[PDB]
Short mmCIF file of N, CA and C in Angstrom, two decimals:
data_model
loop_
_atom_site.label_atom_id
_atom_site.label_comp_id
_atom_site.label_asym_id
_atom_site.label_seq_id
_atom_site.Cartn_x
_atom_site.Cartn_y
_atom_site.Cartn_z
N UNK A 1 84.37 47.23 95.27
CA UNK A 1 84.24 48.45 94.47
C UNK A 1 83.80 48.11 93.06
N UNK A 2 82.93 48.79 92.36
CA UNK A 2 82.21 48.87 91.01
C UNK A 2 82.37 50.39 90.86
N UNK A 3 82.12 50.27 89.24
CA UNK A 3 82.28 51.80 88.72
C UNK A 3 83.08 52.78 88.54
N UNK A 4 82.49 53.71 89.52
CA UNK A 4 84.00 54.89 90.36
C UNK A 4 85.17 54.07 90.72
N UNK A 5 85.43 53.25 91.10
CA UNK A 5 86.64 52.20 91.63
C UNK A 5 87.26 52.31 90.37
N UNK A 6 86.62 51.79 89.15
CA UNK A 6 87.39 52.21 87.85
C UNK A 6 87.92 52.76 87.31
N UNK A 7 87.43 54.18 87.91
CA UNK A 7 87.60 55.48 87.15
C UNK A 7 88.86 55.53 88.13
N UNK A 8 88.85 55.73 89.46
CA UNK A 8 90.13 56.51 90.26
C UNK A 8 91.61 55.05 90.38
N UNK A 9 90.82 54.00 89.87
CA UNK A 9 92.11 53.06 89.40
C UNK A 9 93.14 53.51 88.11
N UNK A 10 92.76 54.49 87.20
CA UNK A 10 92.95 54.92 85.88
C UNK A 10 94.25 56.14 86.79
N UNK A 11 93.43 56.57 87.70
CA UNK A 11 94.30 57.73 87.59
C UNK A 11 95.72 57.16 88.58
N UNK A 12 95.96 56.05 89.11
CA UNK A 12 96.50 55.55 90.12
C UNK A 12 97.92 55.10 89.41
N UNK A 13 96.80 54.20 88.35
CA UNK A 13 98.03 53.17 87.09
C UNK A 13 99.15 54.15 86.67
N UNK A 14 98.93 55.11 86.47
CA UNK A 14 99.86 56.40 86.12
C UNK A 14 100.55 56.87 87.09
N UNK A 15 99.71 57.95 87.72
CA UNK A 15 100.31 58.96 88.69
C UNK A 15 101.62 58.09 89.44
N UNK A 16 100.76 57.00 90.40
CA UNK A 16 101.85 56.14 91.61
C UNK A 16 102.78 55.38 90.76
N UNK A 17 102.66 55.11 89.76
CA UNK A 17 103.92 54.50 88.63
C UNK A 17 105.11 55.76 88.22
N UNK A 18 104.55 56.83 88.46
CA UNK A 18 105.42 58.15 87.88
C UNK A 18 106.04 58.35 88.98
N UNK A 19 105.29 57.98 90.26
CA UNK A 19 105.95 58.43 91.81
C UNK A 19 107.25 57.89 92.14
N UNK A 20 107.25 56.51 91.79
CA UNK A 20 108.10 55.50 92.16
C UNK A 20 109.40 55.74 90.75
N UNK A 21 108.79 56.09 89.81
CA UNK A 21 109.69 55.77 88.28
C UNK A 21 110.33 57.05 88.74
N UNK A 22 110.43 57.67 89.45
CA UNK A 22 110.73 59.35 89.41
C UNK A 22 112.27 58.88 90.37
N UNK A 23 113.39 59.72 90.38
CA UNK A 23 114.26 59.63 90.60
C UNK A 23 114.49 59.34 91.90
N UNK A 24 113.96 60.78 92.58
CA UNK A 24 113.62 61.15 94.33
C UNK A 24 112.97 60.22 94.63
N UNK A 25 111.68 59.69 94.03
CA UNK A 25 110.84 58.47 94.59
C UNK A 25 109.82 58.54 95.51
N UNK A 26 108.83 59.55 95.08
CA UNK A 26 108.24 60.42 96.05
C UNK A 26 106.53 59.21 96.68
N UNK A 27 106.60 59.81 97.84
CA UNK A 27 105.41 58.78 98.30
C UNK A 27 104.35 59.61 97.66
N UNK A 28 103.24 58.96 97.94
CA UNK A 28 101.81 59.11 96.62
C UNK A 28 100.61 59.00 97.80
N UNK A 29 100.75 60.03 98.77
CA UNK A 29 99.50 60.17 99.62
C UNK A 29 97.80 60.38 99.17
N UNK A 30 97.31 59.34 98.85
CA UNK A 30 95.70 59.20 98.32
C UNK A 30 94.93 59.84 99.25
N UNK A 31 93.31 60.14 98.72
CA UNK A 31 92.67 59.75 99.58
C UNK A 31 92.08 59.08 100.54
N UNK A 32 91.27 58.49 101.65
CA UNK A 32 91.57 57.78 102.85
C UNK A 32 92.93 57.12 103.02
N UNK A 33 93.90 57.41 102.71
CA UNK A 33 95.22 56.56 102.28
C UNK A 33 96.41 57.15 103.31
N UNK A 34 97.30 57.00 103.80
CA UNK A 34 98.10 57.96 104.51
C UNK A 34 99.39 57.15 104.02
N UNK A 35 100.26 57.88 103.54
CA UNK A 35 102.04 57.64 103.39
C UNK A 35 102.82 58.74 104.69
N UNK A 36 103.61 57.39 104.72
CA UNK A 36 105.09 57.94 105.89
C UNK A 36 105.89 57.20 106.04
N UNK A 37 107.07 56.97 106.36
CA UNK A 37 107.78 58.63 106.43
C UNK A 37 107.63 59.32 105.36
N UNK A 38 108.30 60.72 104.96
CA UNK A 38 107.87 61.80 103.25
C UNK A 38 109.22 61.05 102.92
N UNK A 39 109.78 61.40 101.92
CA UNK A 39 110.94 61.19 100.89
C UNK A 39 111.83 62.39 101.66
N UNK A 40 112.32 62.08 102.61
CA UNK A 40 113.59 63.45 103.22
C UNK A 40 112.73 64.44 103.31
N UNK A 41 111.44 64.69 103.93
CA UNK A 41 110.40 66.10 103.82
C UNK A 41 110.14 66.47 102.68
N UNK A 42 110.36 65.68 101.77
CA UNK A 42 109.58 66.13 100.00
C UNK A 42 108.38 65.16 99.83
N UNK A 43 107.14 65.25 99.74
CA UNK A 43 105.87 64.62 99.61
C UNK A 43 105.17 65.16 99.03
N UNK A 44 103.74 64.08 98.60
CA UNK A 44 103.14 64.90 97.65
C UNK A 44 101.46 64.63 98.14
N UNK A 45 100.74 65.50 98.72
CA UNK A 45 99.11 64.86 98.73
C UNK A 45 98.63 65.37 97.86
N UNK A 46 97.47 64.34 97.16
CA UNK A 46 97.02 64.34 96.01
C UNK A 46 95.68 64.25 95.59
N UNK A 47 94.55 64.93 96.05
CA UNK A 47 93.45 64.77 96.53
C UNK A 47 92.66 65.12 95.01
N UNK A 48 91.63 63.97 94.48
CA UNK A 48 91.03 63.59 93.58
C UNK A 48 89.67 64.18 93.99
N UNK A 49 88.80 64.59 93.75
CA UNK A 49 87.78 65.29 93.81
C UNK A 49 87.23 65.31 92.59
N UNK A 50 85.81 64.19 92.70
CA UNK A 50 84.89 63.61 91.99
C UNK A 50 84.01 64.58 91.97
N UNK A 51 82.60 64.91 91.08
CA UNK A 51 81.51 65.28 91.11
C UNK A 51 80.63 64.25 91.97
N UNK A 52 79.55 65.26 92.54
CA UNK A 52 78.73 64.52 93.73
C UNK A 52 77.37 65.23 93.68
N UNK A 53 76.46 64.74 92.28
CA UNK A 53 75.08 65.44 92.98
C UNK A 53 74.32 65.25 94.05
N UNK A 54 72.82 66.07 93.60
CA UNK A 54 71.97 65.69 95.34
C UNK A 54 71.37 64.56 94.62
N UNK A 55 71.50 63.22 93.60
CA UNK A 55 70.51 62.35 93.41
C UNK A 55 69.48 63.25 92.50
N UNK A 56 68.64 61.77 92.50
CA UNK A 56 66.87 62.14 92.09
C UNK A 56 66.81 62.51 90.72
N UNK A 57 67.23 62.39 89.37
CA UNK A 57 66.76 62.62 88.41
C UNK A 57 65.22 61.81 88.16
N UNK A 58 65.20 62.00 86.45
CA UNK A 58 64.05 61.94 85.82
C UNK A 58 63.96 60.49 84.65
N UNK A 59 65.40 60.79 84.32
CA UNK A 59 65.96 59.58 83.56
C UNK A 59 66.91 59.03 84.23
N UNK A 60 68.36 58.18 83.61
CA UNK A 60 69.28 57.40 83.93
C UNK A 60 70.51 57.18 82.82
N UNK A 61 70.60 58.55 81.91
CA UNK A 61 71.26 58.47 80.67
C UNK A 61 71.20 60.17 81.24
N UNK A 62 72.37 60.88 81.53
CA UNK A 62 72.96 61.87 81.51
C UNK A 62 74.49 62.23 82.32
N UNK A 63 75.35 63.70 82.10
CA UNK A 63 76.36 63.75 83.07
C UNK A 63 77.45 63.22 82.98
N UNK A 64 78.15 63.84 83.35
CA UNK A 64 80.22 63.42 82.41
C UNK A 64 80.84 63.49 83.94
N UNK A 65 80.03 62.93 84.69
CA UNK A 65 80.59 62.76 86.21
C UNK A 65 82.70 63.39 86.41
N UNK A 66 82.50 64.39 85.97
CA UNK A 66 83.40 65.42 85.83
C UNK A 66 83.98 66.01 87.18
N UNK A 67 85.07 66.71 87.41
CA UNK A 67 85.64 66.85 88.90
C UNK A 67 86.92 67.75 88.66
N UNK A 68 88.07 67.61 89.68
CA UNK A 68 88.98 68.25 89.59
C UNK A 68 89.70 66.98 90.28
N UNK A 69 91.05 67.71 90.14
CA UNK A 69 92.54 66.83 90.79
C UNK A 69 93.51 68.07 91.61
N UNK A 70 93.42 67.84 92.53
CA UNK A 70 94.34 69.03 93.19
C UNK A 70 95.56 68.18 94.07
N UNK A 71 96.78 68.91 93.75
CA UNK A 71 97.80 68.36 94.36
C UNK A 71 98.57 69.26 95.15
N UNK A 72 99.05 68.94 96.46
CA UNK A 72 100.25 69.65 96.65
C UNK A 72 102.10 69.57 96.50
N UNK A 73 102.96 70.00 96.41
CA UNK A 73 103.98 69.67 96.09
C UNK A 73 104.58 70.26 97.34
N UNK A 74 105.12 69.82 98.50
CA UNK A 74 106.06 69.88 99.58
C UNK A 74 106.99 69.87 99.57
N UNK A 75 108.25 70.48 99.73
CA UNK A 75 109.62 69.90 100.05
C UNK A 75 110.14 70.97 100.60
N UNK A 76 111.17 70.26 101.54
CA UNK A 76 111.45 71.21 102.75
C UNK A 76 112.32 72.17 102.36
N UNK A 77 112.80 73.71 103.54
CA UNK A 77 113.96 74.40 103.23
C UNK A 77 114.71 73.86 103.75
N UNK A 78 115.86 73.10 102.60
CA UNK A 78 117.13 73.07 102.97
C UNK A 78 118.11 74.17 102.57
N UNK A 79 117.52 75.52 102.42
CA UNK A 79 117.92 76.89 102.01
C UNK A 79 117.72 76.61 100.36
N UNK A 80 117.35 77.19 99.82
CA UNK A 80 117.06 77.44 97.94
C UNK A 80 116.44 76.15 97.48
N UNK A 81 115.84 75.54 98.12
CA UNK A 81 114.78 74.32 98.15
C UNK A 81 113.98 74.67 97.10
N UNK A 82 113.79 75.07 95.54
CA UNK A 82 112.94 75.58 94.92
C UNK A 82 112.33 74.00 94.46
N UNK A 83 112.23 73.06 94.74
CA UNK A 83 112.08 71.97 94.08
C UNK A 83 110.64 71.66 93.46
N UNK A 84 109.83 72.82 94.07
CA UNK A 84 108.31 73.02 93.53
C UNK A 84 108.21 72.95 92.25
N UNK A 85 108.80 73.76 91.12
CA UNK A 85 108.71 73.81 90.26
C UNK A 85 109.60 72.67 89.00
N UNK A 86 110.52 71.76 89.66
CA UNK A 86 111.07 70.54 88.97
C UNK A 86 109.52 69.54 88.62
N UNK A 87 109.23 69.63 90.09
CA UNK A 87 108.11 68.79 90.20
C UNK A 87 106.86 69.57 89.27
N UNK A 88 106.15 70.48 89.19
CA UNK A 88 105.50 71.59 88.70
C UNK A 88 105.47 70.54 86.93
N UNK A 89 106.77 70.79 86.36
CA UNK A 89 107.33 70.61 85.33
C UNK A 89 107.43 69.11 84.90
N UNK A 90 107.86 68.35 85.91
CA UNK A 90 107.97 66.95 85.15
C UNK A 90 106.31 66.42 85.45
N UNK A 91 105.44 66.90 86.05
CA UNK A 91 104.24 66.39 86.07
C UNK A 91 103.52 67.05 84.99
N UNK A 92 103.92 68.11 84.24
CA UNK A 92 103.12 68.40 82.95
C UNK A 92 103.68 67.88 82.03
N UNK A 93 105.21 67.51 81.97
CA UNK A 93 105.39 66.20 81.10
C UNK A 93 104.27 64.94 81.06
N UNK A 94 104.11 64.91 81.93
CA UNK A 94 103.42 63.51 82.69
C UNK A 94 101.75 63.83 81.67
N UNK A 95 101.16 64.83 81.83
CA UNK A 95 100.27 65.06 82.02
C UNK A 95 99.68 66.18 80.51
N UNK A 96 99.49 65.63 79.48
CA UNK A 96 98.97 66.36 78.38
C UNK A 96 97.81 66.94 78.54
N UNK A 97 96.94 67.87 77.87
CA UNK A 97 95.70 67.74 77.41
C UNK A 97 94.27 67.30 77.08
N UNK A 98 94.96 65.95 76.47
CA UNK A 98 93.82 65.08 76.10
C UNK A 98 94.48 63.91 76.80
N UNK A 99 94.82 63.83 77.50
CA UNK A 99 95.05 62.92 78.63
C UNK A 99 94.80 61.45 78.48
N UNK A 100 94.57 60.58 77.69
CA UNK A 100 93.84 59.41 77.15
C UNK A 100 94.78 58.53 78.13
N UNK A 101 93.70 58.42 79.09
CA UNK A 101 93.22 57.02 79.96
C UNK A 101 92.49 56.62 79.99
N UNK A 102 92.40 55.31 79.72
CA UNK A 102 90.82 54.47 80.03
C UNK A 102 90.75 54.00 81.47
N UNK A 103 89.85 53.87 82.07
CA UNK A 103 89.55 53.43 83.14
C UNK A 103 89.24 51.97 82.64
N UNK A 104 89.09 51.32 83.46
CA UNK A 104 88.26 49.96 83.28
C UNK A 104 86.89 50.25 83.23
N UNK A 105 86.11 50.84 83.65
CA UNK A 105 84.77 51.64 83.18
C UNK A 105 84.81 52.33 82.21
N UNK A 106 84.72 53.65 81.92
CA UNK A 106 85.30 54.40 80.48
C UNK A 106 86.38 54.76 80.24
N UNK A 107 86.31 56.06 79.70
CA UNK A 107 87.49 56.98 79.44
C UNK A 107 87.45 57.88 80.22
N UNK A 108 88.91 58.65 80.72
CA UNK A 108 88.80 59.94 81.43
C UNK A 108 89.32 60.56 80.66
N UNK A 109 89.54 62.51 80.75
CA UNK A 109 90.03 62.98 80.06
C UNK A 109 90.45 64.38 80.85
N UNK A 110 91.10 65.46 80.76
CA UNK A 110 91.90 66.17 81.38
C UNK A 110 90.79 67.74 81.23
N UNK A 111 90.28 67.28 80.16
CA UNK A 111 89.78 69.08 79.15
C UNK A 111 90.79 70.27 79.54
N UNK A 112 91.54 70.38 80.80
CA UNK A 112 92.20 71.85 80.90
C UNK A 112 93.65 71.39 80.46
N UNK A 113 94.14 72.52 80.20
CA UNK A 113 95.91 72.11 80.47
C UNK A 113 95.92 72.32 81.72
N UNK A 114 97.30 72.10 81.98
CA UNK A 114 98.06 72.03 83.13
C UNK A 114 98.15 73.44 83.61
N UNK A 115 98.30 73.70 84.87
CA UNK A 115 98.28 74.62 85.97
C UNK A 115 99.50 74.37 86.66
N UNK A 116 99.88 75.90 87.28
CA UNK A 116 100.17 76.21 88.64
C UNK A 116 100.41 77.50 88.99
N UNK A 117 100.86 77.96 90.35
CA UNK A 117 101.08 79.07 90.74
C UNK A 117 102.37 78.95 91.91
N UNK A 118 102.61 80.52 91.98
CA UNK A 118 103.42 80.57 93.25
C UNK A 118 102.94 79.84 94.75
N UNK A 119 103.88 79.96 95.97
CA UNK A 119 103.78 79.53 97.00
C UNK A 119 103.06 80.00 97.90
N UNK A 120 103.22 79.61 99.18
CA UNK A 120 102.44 80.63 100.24
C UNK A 120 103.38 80.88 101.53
N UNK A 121 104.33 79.61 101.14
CA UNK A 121 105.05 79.33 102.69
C UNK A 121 104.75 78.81 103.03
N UNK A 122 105.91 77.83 104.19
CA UNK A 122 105.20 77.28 105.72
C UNK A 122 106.09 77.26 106.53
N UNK A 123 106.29 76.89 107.64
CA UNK A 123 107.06 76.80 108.96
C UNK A 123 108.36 76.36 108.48
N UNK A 124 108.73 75.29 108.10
CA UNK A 124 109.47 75.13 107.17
C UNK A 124 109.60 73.75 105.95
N UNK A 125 108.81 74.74 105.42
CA UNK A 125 108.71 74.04 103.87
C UNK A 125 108.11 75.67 102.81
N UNK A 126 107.77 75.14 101.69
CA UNK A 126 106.42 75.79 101.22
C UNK A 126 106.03 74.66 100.71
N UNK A 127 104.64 75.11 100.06
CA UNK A 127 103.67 74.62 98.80
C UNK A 127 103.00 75.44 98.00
N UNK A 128 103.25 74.72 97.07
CA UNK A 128 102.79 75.35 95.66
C UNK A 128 101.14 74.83 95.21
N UNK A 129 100.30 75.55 94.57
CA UNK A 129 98.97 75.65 94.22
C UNK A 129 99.01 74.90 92.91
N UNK A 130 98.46 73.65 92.62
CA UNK A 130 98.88 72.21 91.16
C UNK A 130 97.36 71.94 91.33
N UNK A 131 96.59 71.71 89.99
CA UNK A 131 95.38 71.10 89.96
C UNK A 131 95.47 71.15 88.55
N UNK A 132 94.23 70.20 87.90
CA UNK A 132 94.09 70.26 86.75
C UNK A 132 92.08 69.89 87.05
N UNK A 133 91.53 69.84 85.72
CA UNK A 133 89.90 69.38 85.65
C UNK A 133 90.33 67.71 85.31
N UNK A 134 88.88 67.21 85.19
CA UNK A 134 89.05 65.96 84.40
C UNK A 134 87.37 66.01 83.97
N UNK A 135 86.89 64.95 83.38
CA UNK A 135 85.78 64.39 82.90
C UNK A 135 85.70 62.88 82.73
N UNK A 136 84.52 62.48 82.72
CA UNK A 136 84.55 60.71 82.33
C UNK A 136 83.16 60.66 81.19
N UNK A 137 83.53 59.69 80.43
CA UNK A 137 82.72 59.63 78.74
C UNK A 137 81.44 58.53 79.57
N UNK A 138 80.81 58.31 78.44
CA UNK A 138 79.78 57.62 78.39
C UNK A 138 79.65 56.84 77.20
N UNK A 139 80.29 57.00 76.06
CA UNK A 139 80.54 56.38 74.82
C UNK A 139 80.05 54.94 74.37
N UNK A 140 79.21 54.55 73.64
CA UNK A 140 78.82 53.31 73.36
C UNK A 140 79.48 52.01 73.92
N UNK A 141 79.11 50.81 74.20
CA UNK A 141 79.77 49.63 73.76
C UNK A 141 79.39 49.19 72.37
#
């Protein structure tokens, strides 16, 4: 891996360090990546979503290869299971604004605040709706 490998190493050094530093100790399901068993049916998938043009420019100097981060937050009913929103909450601790991570390639950065919304349900669990934007610099050496 070159490049992009850089950039989604930035977001790893954090997030899966917060997973483990976190009390519950929640597994950190990546992309191509699969975690199991969940933490007692509390898990988290965490799907990183890069920008992807069709190719073919004109030059080779443009683009803030910019994207989103969408997460879900799981945990089962053990009746008043609200635990969506602990999690909701200590990940916008986690997670400022100006977000200052460097990648080993550049910088990333957050541009939105933090998000979320209500549930939807499931069989038995719910999940809650968690994403934020990001961007990556281009900034001199």
């Amino acid at each position: 891996g070159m490049s992009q490998d850089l950039i989604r190493a930035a977001f790893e050094k954090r997030l899966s360090d917060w997973a483990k530093a976190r009390t519950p100790a929640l597994p950190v399901a990546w992309q191509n990546t699969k975690f199991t068993p969940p933490a007692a049916g509390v898990y988290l998938r965490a799907y990183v979503m890069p920008a992807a043009t069709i190719s073919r420019d004109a030059a080779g100097d443009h683009r803030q290869y910019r994207g989103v981060f969408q997460v879900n937050v799981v945990m089962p009913i053990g009746d008043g299971s609200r635990s969506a929103e602990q999690v909701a909450a200590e990940l916008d601790a986690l997670f400022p604004v100006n977000l200052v991570m460097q990648s080993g390639g550049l910088a990333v950065r957050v541009r939105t605040p933090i998000s979320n919304g209500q549930p939807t349900t499931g069989d038995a669990d719910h999940t809650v709706p968690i994403s934020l934007g990001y961007d990556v610099q281009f900034y001199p050496e």
